[PDB]
Amino acid sequence: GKNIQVVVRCRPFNLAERKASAHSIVECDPVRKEVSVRTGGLADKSSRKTYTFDMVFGASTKQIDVYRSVVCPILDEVIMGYNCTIFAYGQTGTGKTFTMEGERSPNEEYTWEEDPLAGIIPRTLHQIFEKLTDNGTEFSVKVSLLEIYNEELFDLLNPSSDVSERLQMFDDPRNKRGVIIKGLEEITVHNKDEVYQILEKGAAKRTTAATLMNAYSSRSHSVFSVTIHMKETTIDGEELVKIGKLNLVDLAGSENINQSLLTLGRVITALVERTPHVPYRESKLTRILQDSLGGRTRTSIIATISPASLNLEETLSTLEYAHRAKNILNK
Ligand SMILES: Nc1ncnc2c1ncn2[C@@H]1O[C@H](COP(=O)(O)OP(=O)(O)O)[C@@H](O)[C@H]1O
Ligand SMILES: CCN(CC)C(=O)c1c(NC(=O)c2cccs2)sc2c1C[C@H](C)CC2
């Protein structure tokens, strides 16, 4: 057994909000694992709504804080031969993509491997090599990026095929939580010095999918997957063979047509209510990620929220959803 761990990350105010002397309606207390939301009142007299999570990260949280506290422990587990998934869930504009992918610091100040704005995916890839290269491990790394837009499936990493070619999926008859995606490419990442270019290619494929599909970056779900095959020779000369898997899933924005997002919510409702039928089959996303939801994968949710009063209602909606999720048992 193990419950799904759910963490909240509040994003900071941006330029416009900061010059507009915006006041945060959100207070985060990481030590009591608590986010408090100002639901009407004033900064003078106020009703507040409070929520407890597995972790909360306030507006001051940096990319390094998330990597150290959330990602390292999960990566260690994938290195031990486990499957793990991290979802980012939240309204458009609250930092899902920032969290999972990150941005470049302006004016070329950093290399990619040192950029403070690097998110979970590049930091993860960089550390896999940095951990396994030096200790005595023979290992391979494959990555894939399967994205879902309007219940069709796209491979965003494959450098020799166009983005507009949809893929097909079927059930795996060997394993039962399982599906085969015909024609999804697993790209072998030979060393840390091939990481950037692989991701750059996918970036370029993203730009075009965006031209072709309306509000692609908001309405699409992406699943970036890393697989590590490892033959470890222990200092005692014993040879340990293991398979680690990590899914990094950047969900469609949750703001109030998206069958996968609808079904995700229904799948979570079913799992926390222990309704005996769980509607996995009702969308591509919940079929692909069936094992992440009441399955054998260690699963974490980062719910991204905003400090601004404008987003009160959607912030509340994110936190209620995220808060339900805590009750789901995986193994
Ligand atoms: N923790 C953060 N620190 C700095 N900027 C952030 C943070 N979270 C989100 N942002 C900023 O907010 C804007 C939108 O974030 P983005 O990753 O596109 O959100 P989403 O993917 O949820 O729609 C971007 O300008 C991004 O740089
Ligand atoms: C900054 C442009 N890049 C990196 C090429 C990204 O947008 C990006 C990622 N970010 C990054 O790799 C970085 C940010 C800052 C330092 S490294 S991770 C990722 C992509 C795109 C790809 C489709 C899937 C996974």
Ligand SMILES: [Mg+2]
């Ligand atoms: Mg985004």
